[PDB]
Amino acid sequence: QITTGSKELDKLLQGGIETGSITEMFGEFRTGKTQICHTLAVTCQLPIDRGGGEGKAMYIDTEGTFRPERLLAVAERYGLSGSDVLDNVAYARAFNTDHQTQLLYQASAMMVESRYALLIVDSATALYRTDYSGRGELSARQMHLARFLRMLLRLADEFGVAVVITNQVVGNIIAHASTTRLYLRKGRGETRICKIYDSPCLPEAEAMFAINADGVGDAKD
Amino acid sequence: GPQPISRLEQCGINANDVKKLEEAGFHTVEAVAYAPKKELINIKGISEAKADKILAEAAKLVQITTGSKELDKLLQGGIETGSITEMFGEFRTGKTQICHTLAVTCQLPIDRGGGEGKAMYIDTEGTFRPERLLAVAERYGLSGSDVLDNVAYARAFNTDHQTQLLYQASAMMVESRYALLIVDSATALYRTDYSGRGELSARQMHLARFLRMLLRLADEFGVAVVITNQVVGNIIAHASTTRLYLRKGRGETRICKIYDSPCLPEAEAMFAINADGVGDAKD
Amino acid sequence: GPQPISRLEQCGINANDVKKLEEAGFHTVEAVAYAPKKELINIKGISEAKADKILAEAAKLVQITTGSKELDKLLQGGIETGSITEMFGEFRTGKTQICHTLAVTCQLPIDRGGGEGKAMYIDTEGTFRPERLLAVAERYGLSGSDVLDNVAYARAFNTDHQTQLLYQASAMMVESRYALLIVDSATALYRTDYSGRGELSARQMHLARFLRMLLRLADEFGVAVVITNQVVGNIIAHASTTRLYLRKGRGETRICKIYDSPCLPEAEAMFAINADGVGDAKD
């Protein structure tokens, strides 16, 4: 279980994300999905005794929000070398759905040579909306997404890594595929409310957390 | 860096299709390469075979001071060059005034908060005033005549002309150093031209391509990309790096708020609109 | 005792209708016998004539320690085998932890507060942890491997699958001695599967039949039936013999209250959730 670095969120997840499975966090824009991704991209490298997975991170970006400086901030939070964190995070921005799926072929072979623990896909559903914008092409994006999800599950079961995908809520296929569904909503100021809205293993429950410069971290009124 | 699309023609794409790609707004091999088939297919007079030949051969080759101190502090010193900064607010909030101010401040020395580069103003709303540029130049002690000589201006009558001006901007921005590109009422032409509901996807695609071209030009020339949005879309969020919400305080004093930045905090700063300048609030 | 439904087929009910009754969850001649017509008619692929033939021919034939001492005293020594005990409480109160503890304590000698029987864990919520069983086994000095060998586990994917698992449970519970049947988040699948409002009566009927099957299995094998309900139906009241209300005390220490029992008083006891065990609070 990779620590979220929020204790309340860790309790919400029963200790953190299960490696080897896909965890979906669906919420509005600005809820902190990207911030959580950046935090986890570093916390995954933490020792297992510290709530990490002791593995490298993979950031596949589709939305431009990737900030190595945020990774450096998370590394300094946990007292990790920011340079080694960036050395253990391979980054590439996916411009479309075809490139998004094509990166998985390179990811599977690259993930064999080095130990990774976390795969992040940020705005994972955005490219299926920007690329496939028509209505007659809906089945095409659904087929591509289905294949993409199957490849994700295959990589999760193959390498025992955590699969994190982000969904903007302005598909029902992901429900069976995603193991933990988290609904994120804004609390005013910088403090965000997290709710579990489906999980076959985790209870429906809520936890309050904040987004701090160092970290995704518990709310401290 | 960039790989201008001219090199794609040596791969054996015919030059007429490359001209169609440049009209579409693709100017580099990087630009054509990392896009799916449908982008090139949607262009008039391009089949799936030509799009596959293009993608295949393409894979073979590949801080400006706001002049308000409080606003500069809000931005941590000013706009980051090389990225798109969106200021969304109601009408009469001073968006155009801020644009006019930045059009001159960009030319300021870097030690004075400028970019030491020329400005580009693409207007769609008629609000372009060379006299405001002259006022900002005299504020900072810049030659008003040289400011107008270092600002190239053109009014876009429609969305197609709005995108077409980027083709002249990319080639013209190579010969001279620019630091600021201004697109005023950038979203107005997508509302006045495309007013129907069945044509919404077309204007959304054109806007998406326009924003991608803006980011491409920003990374290519290291210039600041400024676009103005009237708030009487979620697509701009991933594309815009810094979102500023502008609201009126009564009289001439305006409230600025940061509503998204991965690096800059969400925060607010109070400023005023003065004859010389966009300038700090002075109660 | 029971009168397994196999004998009903010799009365001349066809075997396919008996299989449909077993899928529905009727496994004894007692089970077919004491039900009205509508139960059998509501089953898919069963007409009124077949239901009347079934009822007519059917009429011819017809304390496990909690490991918290305070909780054992609250229950007068532990769960009564052969009856349904419902623990309703908020999430994170420790229902699952208590289930994991009992899954091992049931195997304890009767003189030690056990039932000297194997355990059955039917999970609907994913919270099954063999490592928790190992911790409880080492707490009471039981072989963790033998505990897992004496606990048969199966995860129910839906309400129909949840009821279908009882058919395998009834036949499997005949070959080996069991003492405890655990159904964790027993009501969760009735909320996730049947989420609409017009289908409420359908989930209520399915739940009623499932509960009747639980009571039948309890009377049949003399095992304790433990089901967990999350309180973020009034039908369970008559069916459950002992109602326990669970609420969180801050930290890891939980308050237990008895909120209905015809024999046990309404009373409260304080306990904690410890790595080894569900175990008394020790300030």
Side-chain angles (χ1 to χ4, degrees):
Chain A
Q1 292 171 327
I2 305 173
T3 181
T4 73
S6 176
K7 302 301 178 181
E8 294 298 323
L9 192 53
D10 285 354
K11 302 294 184 292
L12 189 59
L13 304 174
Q14 300 289 80
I17 301 291
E18 280 207 57
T19 54
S21 62
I22 305 174
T23 307
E24 179 184 17
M25 69 307 300
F26 65 101
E28 302 292 335
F29 61 95
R30 206 169 54 94
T31 58
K33 292 187 305 290
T34 312
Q35 298 299 323
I36 300 174
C37 295
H38 285 57
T39 297
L40 297 175
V42 186
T43 62
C44 61
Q45 307 178 31
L46 292 168
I48 301 173
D49 174 297
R50 294 191 61 187
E54 297 174 14
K56 297 182 177 182
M58 293 300 291
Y59 200 110
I60 297 179
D61 174 81
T62 74
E63 48 170 284
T65 56
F66 183 80
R67 295 295 181 272
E69 297 189 348
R70 292 298 299 161
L71 309 178
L72 300 177
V74 183
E76 60 82 21
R77 172 188 176 184
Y78 293 90
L80 298 180
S81 176
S83 60
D84 274 335
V85 170
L86 298 184
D87 294 330
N88 297 330
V89 174
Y91 165 73
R93 179 173 182 179
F95 284 173
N96 64 34
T97 59
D98 192 72
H99 185 208
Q100 181 176 324
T101 303
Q102 194 276 341
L103 294 179
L104 296 186
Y105 280 96
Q106 302 180 358
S108 60
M110 188 285 283
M111 194 148 279
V112 172
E113 297 181 17
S114 301
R115 173 171 171 88
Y116 286 80
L118 182 58
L119 174 58
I120 302 172
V121 184
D122 200 24
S123 279
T125 65
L127 301 183
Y128 286 99
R129 310 173 182 176
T130 60
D131 299 352
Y132 301 87
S133 298
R135 288 299 178 181
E137 295 302 320
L138 295 172
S139 61
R141 72 179 181 73
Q142 298 178 333
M143 288 321 171
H144 196 84
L145 178 57
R147 185 176 57 189
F148 179 81
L149 298 175
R150 295 192 300 270
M151 294 177 70
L152 295 180
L153 186 58
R154 184 174 297 176
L155 292 178
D157 303 331
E158 189 173 25
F159 301 97
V161 306
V163 180
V164 176
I165 61 181
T166 69
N167 185 22
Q168 305 177 339
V169 182
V170 178
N172 300 326
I173 189 167
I174 313 170
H176 189 283
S178 63
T179 67
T180 311
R181 268 178 168 191
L182 311 177
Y183 175 77
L184 309 177
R185 65 176 179 274
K186 184 190 176 198
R188 324 316 281 184
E190 294 286 17
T191 319
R192 305 304 201 278
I193 311 171
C194 180
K195 183 183 178 180
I196 292 176
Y197 191 72
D198 171 49
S199 188
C201 190
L202 301 170
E204 311 100 313
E206 307 180 331
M208 193 54 191
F209 69 99
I211 309 174
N212 288 318
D214 304 338
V216 167
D218 296 307
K220 300 297 178 179
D221 49 358
Chain B
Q3 321 303 140
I5 195 173
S6 55
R7 290 180 181 186
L8 193 78
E9 188 272 342
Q10 298 80 348
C11 305
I13 305 311
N14 50 16
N16 64 6
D17 216 15
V18 183
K19 278 327 177 188
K20 302 176 181 178
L21 301 179
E22 298 190 8
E23 285 171 17
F26 308 138
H27 304 268
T28 66
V29 188
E30 179 174 35
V32 305
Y34 319 130
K37 292 156 190 274
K38 195 32 56 181
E39 315 312 325
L40 306 181
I41 301 173
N42 192 29
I43 306 176
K44 51 180 178 181
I46 295 184
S47 63
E48 301 185 358
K50 297 182 180 182
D52 294 334
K53 299 180 182 180
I54 298 173
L55 298 177
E57 295 177 352
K60 303 177 182 179
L61 298 178
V62 183
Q63 292 170 327
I64 305 173
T65 182
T66 73
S68 176
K69 302 301 178 181
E70 294 298 323
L71 192 53
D72 285 354
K73 302 295 184 292
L74 189 59
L75 304 174
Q76 300 289 79
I79 301 291
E80 280 207 57
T81 54
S83 62
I84 305 174
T85 307
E86 180 184 17
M87 68 307 300
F88 65 100
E90 302 291 335
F91 61 94
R92 206 169 55 94
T93 58
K95 292 187 305 290
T96 312
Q97 298 299 323
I98 300 174
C99 295
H100 285 57
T101 297
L102 297 175
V104 186
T105 62
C106 61
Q107 307 178 31
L108 292 168
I110 301 172
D111 174 297
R112 294 191 61 186
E116 297 174 14
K118 298 181 177 182
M120 293 300 291
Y121 201 109
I122 297 179
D123 174 81
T124 74
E125 49 170 284
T127 57
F128 183 80
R129 295 295 181 272
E131 297 189 348
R132 292 298 300 161
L133 309 178
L134 300 177
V136 184
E138 60 82 21
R139 173 187 176 183
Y140 293 90
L142 298 180
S143 176
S145 60
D146 274 336
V147 170
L148 298 184
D149 294 330
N150 297 330
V151 174
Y153 166 73
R155 180 173 182 179
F157 284 172
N158 54 79
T159 60
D160 192 72
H161 185 208
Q162 181 176 324
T163 303
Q164 194 276 341
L165 294 179
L166 296 186
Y167 175 77
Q168 302 180 358
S170 60
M172 188 285 284
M173 195 149 279
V174 172
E175 297 181 17
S176 301
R177 173 171 170 88
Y178 286 80
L180 182 58
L181 174 58
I182 302 172
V183 184
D184 200 24
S185 279
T187 65
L189 301 183
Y190 287 98
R191 310 174 182 176
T192 60
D193 299 352
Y194 301 87
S195 298
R197 288 299 179 181
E199 216 171 348
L200 294 172
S201 61
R203 72 180 181 73
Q204 299 177 333
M205 292 177 72
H206 196 84
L207 178 57
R209 186 177 57 189
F210 179 81
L211 298 175
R212 295 192 300 270
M213 293 177 70
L214 295 179
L215 186 58
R216 293 181 183 173
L217 292 178
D219 303 331
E220 189 173 25
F221 301 98
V223 306
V225 180
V226 176
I227 61 181
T228 69
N229 185 22
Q230 306 177 339
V231 182
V232 178
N234 300 326
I235 189 167
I236 313 170
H238 60 285
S240 63
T241 67
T242 311
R243 268 178 168 191
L244 310 177
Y245 175 77
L246 309 177
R247 65 176 179 274
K248 184 190 176 198
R250 323 316 281 184
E252 293 177 350
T253 319
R254 305 304 201 278
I255 311 171
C256 180
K257 183 183 178 180
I258 292 176
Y259 190 72
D260 171 49
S261 188
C263 190
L264 301 170
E266 310 99 313
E268 307 180 332
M270 193 54 191
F271 69 99
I273 309 174
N274 288 318
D276 304 338
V278 167
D280 296 308
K282 300 297 178 179
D283 49 358
Chain C
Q3 321 303 140
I5 195 173
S6 54
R7 290 180 180 186
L8 193 78
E9 188 272 343
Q10 298 80 348
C11 305
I13 305 311
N14 50 16
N16 64 6
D17 216 15
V18 183
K19 277 327 177 189
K20 302 176 181 178
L21 301 179
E22 298 190 8
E23 285 171 17
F26 308 138
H27 305 268
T28 66
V29 188
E30 178 174 35
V32 305
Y34 319 133
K37 292 156 190 274
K38 195 32 56 181
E39 315 313 325
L40 306 181
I41 301 173
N42 192 29
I43 306 176
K44 51 180 178 181
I46 295 184
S47 63
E48 301 185 358
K50 297 182 180 182
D52 294 333
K53 299 179 182 180
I54 298 173
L55 298 177
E57 295 177 352
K60 303 177 182 179
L61 298 178
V62 183
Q63 292 170 327
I64 305 173
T65 182
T66 73
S68 176
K69 302 301 178 181
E70 294 298 323
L71 192 53
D72 285 354
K73 302 295 184 292
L74 189 59
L75 304 174
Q76 299 288 79
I79 301 291
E80 280 207 57
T81 54
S83 62
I84 305 174
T85 307
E86 180 184 17
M87 69 307 300
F88 65 101
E90 302 291 335
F91 61 94
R92 206 169 54 94
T93 58
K95 292 187 305 290
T96 312
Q97 298 299 323
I98 300 174
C99 295
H100 285 57
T101 297
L102 297 175
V104 186
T105 62
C106 61
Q107 307 178 31
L108 292 168
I110 301 173
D111 174 297
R112 294 191 61 186
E116 297 174 14
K118 297 182 177 182
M120 293 299 291
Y121 201 110
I122 297 179
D123 174 81
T124 74
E125 49 170 284
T127 56
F128 183 80
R129 295 295 181 272
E131 297 189 348
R132 292 297 299 161
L133 309 179
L134 300 177
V136 183
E138 60 82 21
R139 173 187 176 183
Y140 293 90
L142 298 180
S143 176
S145 60
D146 274 335
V147 170
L148 298 184
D149 294 330
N150 297 330
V151 174
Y153 166 74
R155 180 173 182 179
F157 285 170
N158 54 79
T159 60
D160 193 72
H161 186 208
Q162 181 176 324
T163 303
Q164 195 276 341
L165 294 179
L166 296 186
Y167 175 77
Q168 302 180 358
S170 60
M172 188 285 284
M173 194 149 279
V174 172
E175 297 181 17
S176 301
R177 173 171 171 88
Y178 286 80
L180 182 58
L181 174 58
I182 302 172
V183 184
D184 200 24
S185 278
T187 65
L189 301 183
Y190 287 98
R191 310 174 182 176
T192 60
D193 298 352
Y194 301 87
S195 298
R197 288 299 178 181
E199 216 171 348
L200 294 172
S201 61
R203 72 180 181 73
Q204 299 177 333
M205 288 321 171
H206 196 84
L207 177 57
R209 186 176 57 189
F210 180 81
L211 298 175
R212 295 192 300 270
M213 293 177 70
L214 295 179
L215 186 58
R216 293 181 183 174
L217 292 178
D219 303 331
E220 189 173 25
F221 301 100
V223 306
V225 180
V226 176
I227 61 181
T228 69
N229 185 22
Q230 305 177 339
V231 182
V232 178
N234 300 326
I235 189 167
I236 313 170
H238 189 283
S240 63
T241 67
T242 311
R243 267 179 168 192
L244 311 177
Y245 175 77
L246 310 177
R247 65 176 179 274
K248 184 190 176 198
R250 324 316 281 184
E252 294 286 17
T253 319
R254 306 304 201 278
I255 311 171
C256 180
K257 183 183 178 180
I258 292 176
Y259 191 72
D260 171 49
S261 188
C263 190
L264 301 170
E266 309 99 313
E268 307 180 332
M270 193 54 191
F271 69 99
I273 309 174
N274 288 318
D276 304 338
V278 167
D280 296 308
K282 300 297 178 179
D283 49 357

